[PDB]
Amino acid sequence: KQAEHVPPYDVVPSMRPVVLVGPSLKGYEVTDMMQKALFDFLKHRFDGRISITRVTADLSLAKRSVLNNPGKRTIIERSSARSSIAEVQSEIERIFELAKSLQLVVLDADTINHPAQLAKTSLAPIIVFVKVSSPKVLQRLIRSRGKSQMKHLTVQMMAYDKLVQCPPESFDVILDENQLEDACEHLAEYLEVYWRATH
Amino acid sequence: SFFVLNLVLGVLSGEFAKERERVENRRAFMKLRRQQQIERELNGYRAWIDKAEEVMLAEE
Amino acid sequence: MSIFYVVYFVVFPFFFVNIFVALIIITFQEQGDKMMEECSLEKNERAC
């Protein structure tokens, strides 16, 4: 039974990092602005107790049983020497040590759009979903953004329906609220109890 | 004068109550209610966009 | 100057007074019963 040999114990960070997914593809004007408002509350509410970091590289391919050493050196001129796996594999230790300090770390990747893509990573952060109750407000909200956003609205709505099909269970917590204070209190209450849960 | 006015008001109010529950009227009111609900849910989300936008410019 | 009086009549005695009447009609609490769960299943068939 050595074809897979799934380990019973997997090394995981001391503190769960923070990932926010939804309501569509990241990296666009609407989704960057929609998700960014949550971070500012985290900085102000947990000032002196939170670390804020942004990662640009992909993270969905964070696997554990790829090979003994995929792309160990860049001088061998192998397939992985010129690939992007060298930097990605190096930064997975960066998040591991940041959470080792017993302090929360936020993740701001521009490649996560579904919990299924982060279901095979040993980092395994906290999946928080910001979703609208109805699809009818998305197109109207896109219209107010500008002319450029309307051109990409077809792909913008593509992920919204697909991300809905994901079991809420899959997400760690949900934010179906629509205002500031209720969402800020709901997020802070879970983490404040979680902060005391680790001490 | 007074009794006839009372009877007219009662009959008219009863007819208005009865006719407010017709299928077309119910459909129109449901359309208005869904419009209002969508607008109410959209107004709350707009606060997020402005609150975020103010902070980033403040922190440049 | 009869525009002023026509507009006034269209607004106050034709619209606002009927607004008062309608508001009193649609928000009239029952006086005789003053109860919450008299039948809890129907209201008119109690006499029937």
Partner: peptide
């Protein structure tokens, strides 16, 4: 609000109009 924590003074007009609606679809 009762779900956020988890995760009959009607007038005569209101009563009659509510009862008139549930008896209309049939």
């Amino acid at each position: 609000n009762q779900k956020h924590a988890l995760q009959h003074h009607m007038s005569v007009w209101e009563q009659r109009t509510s009862q008139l609606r549930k008896h209309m679809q049939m």
